[PDB]
């Protein structure tokens, strides 16, 4: 059948810059590109390789280059941002997310860690939070360690939109598990990686304050 490898998964740009999305196909049929903005219906951008659909400006362009179809969007406007998909027959690419970013100086995240409250611990559950506040760029990695042991699956991340005034990002990470499990261990820590940090910063706690 047809497989459609789309890349990159995410793309962070500012107005006026150019986006380059690609799509590798196993077949050679008619490829099309769609744009889907949040809370809006997807819209045909390009079809049959390089032909623009109705209304679409000339800054959108596609190239027929190899088994690799590419979509170029030059001089990005605010309306050009969203999630783009390539399509061949009934098959779709995994989707590329093109989101706005406003260029500003680099800023290291202030890192805070929050132990579980007592009220929650009386519900057989314990949540541990690791806040990354006011940093740039947005790309950051949080990594939980409990008694020197790396965690996976038991954490969920959440990010805010870019702030209007100071052009920064904040990020939360919630390590969730059962009270029984929580009590078994002593040390809890989240490790933060970021361009604004020379080395990975760590925040941690035990139960003794």
């Amino acid at each position: 059948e047809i497989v459609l490898t789309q890349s990159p998964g995410t793309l962070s740009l500012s107005p006026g810059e150019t986006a380059i999305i690609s799509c590798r196909t196993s077949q050679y049929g008619s490829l099309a590109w769609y744009q889907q903005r949040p809370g809006q219906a997807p819209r045909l951008v390009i079809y049959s390789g390089s032909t623009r659909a109705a209304g679409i400006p000339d800054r959108f362009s596609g190239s027929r280059w190899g088994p690799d179809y590419t979509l170029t969007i030059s001089n990005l406007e605010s309306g050009d941002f969203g999630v783009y998909y390539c399509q061949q027959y009934e098959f779709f690419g995994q989707g590329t997310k093109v989101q706005v970013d406003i260029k500003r100086t680099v800023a290291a995240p202030s890192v805070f860690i929050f132990p579980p409250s007592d009220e929650q611990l009386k519900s057989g559950t314990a949540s541990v939070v690791c806040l990354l506040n006011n940093f740039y760029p947005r790309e950051a990695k949080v990594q939980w360690k409990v008694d020197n042991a790396l965690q996976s699956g038991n954490s969920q991340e959440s990010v805010t939109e870019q702030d209007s005034k100071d052009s920064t990002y904040s990020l939360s990470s919630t390590l969730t598990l059962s009270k029984a499990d929580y009590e078994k261990h002593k040390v809890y820590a989240c490790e933060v990686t970021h361009q604004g940090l020379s080395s990975p910063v760590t925040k941690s706690f035990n139960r003794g304050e």
């Binding site: 219906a41 045909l44 079809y47 989707g95 939070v129």
Partner: protein
């Protein structure tokens, strides 16, 4: 001009069914086909099937066979050809069927334009499938602790459905507030956090209340945040 107008959003329990309509106009409905496609949160686009206007012939995606059916409706008067209604029925629903369902039609015929090049889209129909019942949130305090600014916040857990709003001190404390987008837990219930960086000198002085509002369950709950 071509117009595709779908029916409204709906909530559903697992194992139940959902029927969606798509009102078409502006073209001879018999001479075209309506495809259905869904936008799944975190999984992208998935083609469901198509139906042809002429006879109502259908082709369903293999992975969805036995759970979907498509019918259409149009005028039997050849002097009123420029409208029709396509239907999509989805049965044996699961949480994985939670998605935005769209009805689409191909662009103007050309040597290049295949049948899967969709110029026209319905506005979409949001279907949410959940076992969870309407449930108000439990609120816990993210206590502050040890250029010295302290961080505190409120942990709002296990509520359904969205949304919940969080204000601080009756909405008077706005400087430094970050209320993160909600997150769906494996339990099927929503959770979020709201934090605020403040002067560490104010922890012995000022009061910090987080006001949590959740319309779907008629619950308002104020919560005090302090250290230890």
């Amino acid at each position: 001009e071509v117009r595709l107008i779908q029916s409204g959003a709906v909530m559903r329990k697992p194992g139940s069914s959902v029927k969606i309509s798509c009102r078409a106009s502006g073209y001879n409905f018999r001479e075209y086909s309506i495809h259905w496609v869904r936008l799944i949160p975190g999984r992208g686009l998935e083609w469901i099937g198509w139906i042809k206007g002429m006879w109502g012939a259908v082709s369903y995606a293999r992975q969805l066979q036995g759970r979907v059916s498509m019918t259409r409706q149009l005028s039997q008067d050849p002097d009123d050809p420029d409208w029709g209604i396509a239907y999509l029925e989805f049965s044996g629903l699961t949480s994985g069927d939670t998605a935005e369902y769209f009805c689409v039609r191909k662009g103007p015929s050309c040597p290049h334009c295949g049948d899967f090049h969709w110029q026209h889209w319905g506005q979409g129909t949001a279907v949410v499938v959940s076992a969870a019942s309407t449930k108000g949130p439990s609120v816990f305090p993210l206590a502050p602790s040890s250029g010295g600014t302290a961080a505190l916040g409120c942990l709002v857990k296990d509520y359904f459905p969205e949304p919940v709003t969080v204000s601080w001190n009756s909405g008077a404390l706005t400087s430094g507030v970050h209320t993160f987008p909600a997150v769906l837990q494996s339990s099927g219930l929503y959770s979020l956090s709201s934090v605020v960086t403040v002067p560490s000198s104010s922890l012995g002085t000022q009061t910090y209340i987080c006001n949590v509002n959740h319309k779907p369950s008629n619950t308002k709950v104020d919560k005090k945040v302090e250290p230890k």
